[PDB]
């Protein structure tokens, strides 16, 4: 690396010194991808070594073993792990790939070519070559489309993916006839982000999940071909700033939106994030608390339909703002929650009082109580539930962990997008170092008053 006297960047901005050095920049990326897959493999091996089989997966502080378990690699018809060898294989393969990628990144960072155009014109690129940048973007889009179609192939033909909505309490279900309806998929992408709709978190079945994955993979492949075989239009040239920093800022804004959205998936979704592996969501364990007390107090003999709590609304059953019958407690905010242990109990008009009186399954009875106990409360130093509890149980929900961390990372990356977008605009305009002091723009403007 250089010093500050030749590059103009201090040590705390050292990665800027390799903005125009394509070979070293590539080495930084390859070593970084090695770091990411190294964390994947190492954390997978750590969670496998720290695995107790009889305990549920969410009570052990495991964040990515549920990610493999959602794919159905070694889970049973109730979330039972049975075997952890797929997890071990995944961790070992990630670690070996980390060794390979780290060797490549270190090689290009240290003794790789300094700049790529003078020796490898296919990999050489300048930031102002819009055709070359769109070529690289098309390559990565084709790669991402193949990655999405890999999950599609696994769900369709390799007998995987765990359906939590399967009768009996979820099961690894091979998916046949995914819903590839364009109106349906675009309806999920354009619906409201609020409670009634949920925008994109509210996808509730693997058929729609795999249909959307088919759509995103085909669209990514077609767009990759399109960017390889095209050049950006003049309106795009006039609208965008074409520099390596501006491209980074675009990526930063996109990945910050992705981080916020993934935080929302973690907190609310229970289909792509099954509760048997991730623990209860926000709405459930509260809906579960309202359900367990209803089924307890009707076993003791009290009429739950009479209800009439301290405010005259209902201790167990009440009416939502829309005429559907919902749970009577304060958990009338989570009245739109849908769970595998709720839907067979739920009908068109409401919660089906006749079903609440007669048809309640023991698996639902066990699941709701065990969800009520393991709420997504928890404190940051472990300990138990609400902030006023005592040192009794060691549990914090993985949904809470990777919702809080992902929101923090998304906000930081939005801040970084602001920083890099502003600096890219200032560098393209020529005043990223300061005001010119002999022709400043303010003295060329009329005073306000």
């Amino acid at each position: 690396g250089r010093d500050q006297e030749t590059t103009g960047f201090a040590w705390w901005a050292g990665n800027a010194r390799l903005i125009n050095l394509s070979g070293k920049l590539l080495g930084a990326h390859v070593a970084h991808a090695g770091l990411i897959v190294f964390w994947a493999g190492a954390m997978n091996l750590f969670e496998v070594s720290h695995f107790v089989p009889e305990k549920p997966m969410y009570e052990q502080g495991l964040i990515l073993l549920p990610h493999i378990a959602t794919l159905g690699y070694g889970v049973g018809p109730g979330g039972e792990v049975l075997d952890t060898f797929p997890y071990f294989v995944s961790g070992v393969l990630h670690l070996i790939s980390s060794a390979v990628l780290g060797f490549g990144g270190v090689y290009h960072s240290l003794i790789g070519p300094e700049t790529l155009e003078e020796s490898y014109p296919f990999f050489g690129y300048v930031w102002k070559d819009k055709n070359k940048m769109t070529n690289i973007l098309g390559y990565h889009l084709i790669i991402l489309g193949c990655g999405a179609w890999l999950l599609v192939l696994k769900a369709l033909y390799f007998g995987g993916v765990y359906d939590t909505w399967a009768p009996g309490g979820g099961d690894v279900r091979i998916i046949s006839n995914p819903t590839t309806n364009a109106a349906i998929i675009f309806g999920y992408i354009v619906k409201s982000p609020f409670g009634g709709d949920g925008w994109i978190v509210s996808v509730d079945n693997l058929e729609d999940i795999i249909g959307g994955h088919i759509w995103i993979g085909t669209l990514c492949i077609l767009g990759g071909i399109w960017h390889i075989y095209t050049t950006p239009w003049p309106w795009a040239r006039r609208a965008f700033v074409w520099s390596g920093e501006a491209y980074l800022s675009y990526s930063l804004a996109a990945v910050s939106l992705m981080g916020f959205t993934a935080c929302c998936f973690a907190w609310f979704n229970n289909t792509a994030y099954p509760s048997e592996f991730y623990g209860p969501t926000g709405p459930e364990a509260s809906q579960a608390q309202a359900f367990t007390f209803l089924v307890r107090d009707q076993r003791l003999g009290a009429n739950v339909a009479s209800a009439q709590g301290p405010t005259g609304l209902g201790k167990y059953l009440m009416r939502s703002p829309t005429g559907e019958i919902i749970f009577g407690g304060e958990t009338m905010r989570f009245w739109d929650f849908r769970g595998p242990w709720v839907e067979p109990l739920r009908g068109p008009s409401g919660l089906d009082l006749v079903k609440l009186k007669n048809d309640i399954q023991p698996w639902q009875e066990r699941r709701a109580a065990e969800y009520m106990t393991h709420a997504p409360l928890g404190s940051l130093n472990s300990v138990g539930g609400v902030a006023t509890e005592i040192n009794a149980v060691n549990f914090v929900s993985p949904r809470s962990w990777l919702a809080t961390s992902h929101f923090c990372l998304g906000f930081f990356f939005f801040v970084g997008h602001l920083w890099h977008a502003g600096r890219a605009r200032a560098a393209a305009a020529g005043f990223e170092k300061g005001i010119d002091r002999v022709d400043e723009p303010v003295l060329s403007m009329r005073p306000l008053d």
Binding site: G74, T84, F85, G112, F158, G159
Partner: protein, 242 residues
């Protein structure tokens, strides 16, 4: 076009940052097709021994291409529904041991019962192959009538180039231009090396799994984690790690 495969600045078996340009042996200077500078053992010795072994490499390459096609295609037809009766390559000889005979499937109008026995097939194969292998060294062929040139005489193989004889062996031409001829030579030697690797893979996979390569690829595409080298080396299964 041609600079990528010939000359000092050609594609080597290791990249520039992993292999210096003066580390190539002096007898591999990018004058032959498929020159990647790959010779870690002292087998090439000099340029004339390299040229002499090139004949063995090219003959083995063409035979390996014909091989790889002859293993993959009939087994795939037999597994997909054709009446092949012995499509698997390591057991096709056992179907003619006593009185059996292989059915020939000339697509699309296939399924024909050949009546030649094993003794007649072996005799005619040895006779024809000895004749062609003796003609290859001697460079003499009596008759003609090839699509390359109408009814060529016997005095046309003389004066030709061995290991690459044009004329009667080139019905479609497309090789008189030297640059595309050299590029196609590189294509041929690379396809031949791929075919050699493939047929060695076919033999080793057959010995390991007990089935043909088409069965191997179909079962692997059906379940890659449930059927691979790791699975076939393991046996039946293992106790789950709980």
């Amino acid at each position: 076009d041609l600079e990528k495969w010939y000359g000092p600045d050609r594609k080597l078996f290791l990249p520039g940052g992993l292999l210096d340009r003066d580390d190539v042996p002096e007898y591999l200077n990018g004058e032959l097709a498929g020159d990647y500078g790959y010779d870690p053992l002292g087998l090439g010795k000099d340029e004339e021994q390299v040229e002499k072994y090139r004949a063995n490499e090219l003959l083995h390459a063409r035979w390996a291409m014909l091989a790889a096609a002859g293993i993959i295609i009939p087994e795939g037809l037999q597994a997909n529904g054709a009446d092949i009766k012995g499509g698997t390559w390591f057991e096709t000889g056992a179907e003619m041991l006593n009185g059996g005979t292989l059915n020939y499937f000339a697509v699309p109008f296939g399924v024909v019962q050949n009546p030649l026995p094993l003794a007649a097939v072996t005799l005619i194969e040895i006779v024809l192959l000895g004749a062609v292998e003796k003609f290859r060294v001697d460079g003499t062929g009596p008759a003609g009538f090839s699509p390359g040139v109408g009814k060529f005489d016997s005095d046309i193989f003389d004066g030709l180039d061995k290991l690459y004889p044009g004329g009667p062996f080139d019905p479609l031409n497309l090789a008189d231009d030297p640059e595309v001829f050299a590029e196609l030579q590189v294509k041929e030697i690379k396809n031949g090396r791929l075919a050699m690797i493939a047929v060695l893979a076919f033999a080793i996979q057959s010995y390991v799994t007990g089935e043909g390569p088409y069965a191997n690829i179909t079962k692997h595409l059906s379940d890659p984690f449930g059927y691979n080298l790791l699975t076939v080396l393991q046996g039946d299964d293992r106790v789950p790690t709980l």
